[PDB]
């Protein structure tokens, strides 16, 4: 035995940064997208989702990297000075911005990153922030149980396999700069890298296209292709 399995380890399997979200933030004269709130999850994309759903439970420290790409929108010769983007983390319960100049942007206790355009992509790390002892990719249950004494069925009605409505909060991204006379549109791509990963209860990989945050399937349910029984 001289061939090794260093690259098949769980840490190596997730050691790549996967894009999990693309957020559009526009700066223009203040129906608008001057600030964008994105709920944190890996299920907006399939690749990392499929890799993680190889297992039932996980525990990993995350690393987020933000790549910002700005462009003009129908500019004739209108130009702009280098922009600064504010990415504020809003955990469940904290107030959420209602405008791009709201008081919530003060970031007194909410962590925030101020990224200057043209610099290196903004990278930070997060520890395991799970309420339980491990993350639950699959939850075979509800959060509310409808009881006999409930006045109406909606009291106990809950989404299947949904644990909490506000899983880990949102990221609110704005352009701190005031509006230039010409519109500037930017895309922030968030790349998520698990680290120190531990996994439990392996599961078969998804074989059909994802349909929503659950195991629901709707279309393209015939994956295997035609092949002769005795054809090599």
């Amino acid at each position: 035995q001289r061939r090794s399995r260093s690259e098949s380890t769980i840490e190596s399997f997730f050691a790549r940064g996967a894009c999990v979200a693309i957020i559009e933030v526009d700066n223009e004269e203040p129906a608008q997208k001057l600030f964008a709130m994105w709920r944190i999850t890996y299920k907006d994309t399939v690749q990392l989702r499929r890799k993680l759903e190889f297992f039932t439970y996980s525990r990993f420290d995350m690393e987020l990297t933000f790549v910002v790409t700005a462009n003009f929108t129908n500019t004739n010769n209108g130009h702009a000075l280098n922009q600064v983007y504010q990415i504020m983390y809003i955990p469940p319960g904290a107030p959420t911005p209602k405008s791009w100049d709201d008081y919530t942007w003060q970031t007194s206790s909410n962590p925030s990153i101020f990224y200057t355009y043209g610099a290196a992509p903004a990278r930070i790390s997060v520890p395991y922030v799970g309420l339980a002892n491990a993350y639950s990719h699959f939850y075979d249950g509800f959060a509310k149980v409808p009881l006999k004494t409930d006045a109406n069925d909606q009291i106990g009605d809950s989404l299947y396999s949904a644990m909490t409505v506000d899983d880990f909060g949102v990221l609110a991204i704005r352009v701190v700069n005031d509006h230039n006379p010409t519109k500037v549109t930017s895309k922030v791509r968030i790349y998520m890298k698990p680290k120190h990963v531990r996994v439990w209860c392996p599961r078969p990989p998804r074989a059909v296209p994802y349909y929503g945050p659950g195991v629901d399937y709707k279309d393209n349910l015939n994956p295997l292709s035609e092949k002769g029984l005795t054809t090599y």
Partner: protein
């Protein structure tokens, strides 16, 4: 193969899921009232049967004092011992795959996502049945809000063939007539609510179709017997009465 005695119930290969025996972590532990084999309602395996599925501990919600402890206390944990019995003659042929899936989330029948109701998602001891194809619900006025498992997709968007990654046992009528799986408590928490969360899912699929001699129609019984093991509850309060309709 050998005697299997738990509490006051005895059953005349057995696989331990993930190589872990059920174990304990002031939790209330009924050493006898709950540690015993409860027999679920028998199902009938025919030539046109697609499969069956049950959810644990939901299947034992009305089984003796185990259900009473489950409903009275707030959060409880329990391992299980599942024993599937299917006796056939030497001239019968077939094979059953018995899979114990942790967090056996199933797919719905409507375009709305995660819209399955608690009543339908918790069938109890009767369980449910897989289907050959995906039948989309069309009753917009009164959606059924029930699962639509697919046999070859395992009801979760994965291929049936890879389901053997889960703890499994094959009842092949030519060699064995019973299967036994010992499941420990598997969850992201040391203890969790049982009324709202199901820890395990038992799926029985007819891998090879049943056949007998040259008979057109043949059906044989399958009986599931589940023994809670090392079950402990905590958070005693008034009794929970779920709305099953």
């Amino acid at each position: 193969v050998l005697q299997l005695t738990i509490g006051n119930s005895t059953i005349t290969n057995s696989v331990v899921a993930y190589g872990r025996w059920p174990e304990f972590i002031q939790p209330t532990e009924p050493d006898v009232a709950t540690c015993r084999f409860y027999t679920l309602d028998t199902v009938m395996w025919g030539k046109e049967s697609k499969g069956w599925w049950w959810k644990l501990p939901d299947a034992l919600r009305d089984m003796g004092l185990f259900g009473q402890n489950m409903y009275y206390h707030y959060l409880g944990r329990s391992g299980y011992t599942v024993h599937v019995q299917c006796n056939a003659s030497k001239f019968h042929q077939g094979a059953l795959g018995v899979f114990a899936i942790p967090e056996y989330c199933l797919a719905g029948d409507s375009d709305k996502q995660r819209y399955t109701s608690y009543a339908n998602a918790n069938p109890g001891e009767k369980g449910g049945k897989f289907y050959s194809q995906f039948n989309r619900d069309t009753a917009v006025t009164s959606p059924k809000r029930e699962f639509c498992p697919v046999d070859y997709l395992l009801g979760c968007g994965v291929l049936l063939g890879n389901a053997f990654v889960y703890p499994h046992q094959i009842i092949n009528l030519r060699t064995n007539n019973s299967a036994t799986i010992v499941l420990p408590y598997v969850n992201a928490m040391a203890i969790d609510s049982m009324v709202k969360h199901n820890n395990w899912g038992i799926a029985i699929l007819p891998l090879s179709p049943l056949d007998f001699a040259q008979e057109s129609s043949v059906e044989i019984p399958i009986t599931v017997t589940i023994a809670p093991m090392c079950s402990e509850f905590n958070g005693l309060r008034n009794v929970t009465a779920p709305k099953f309709q």
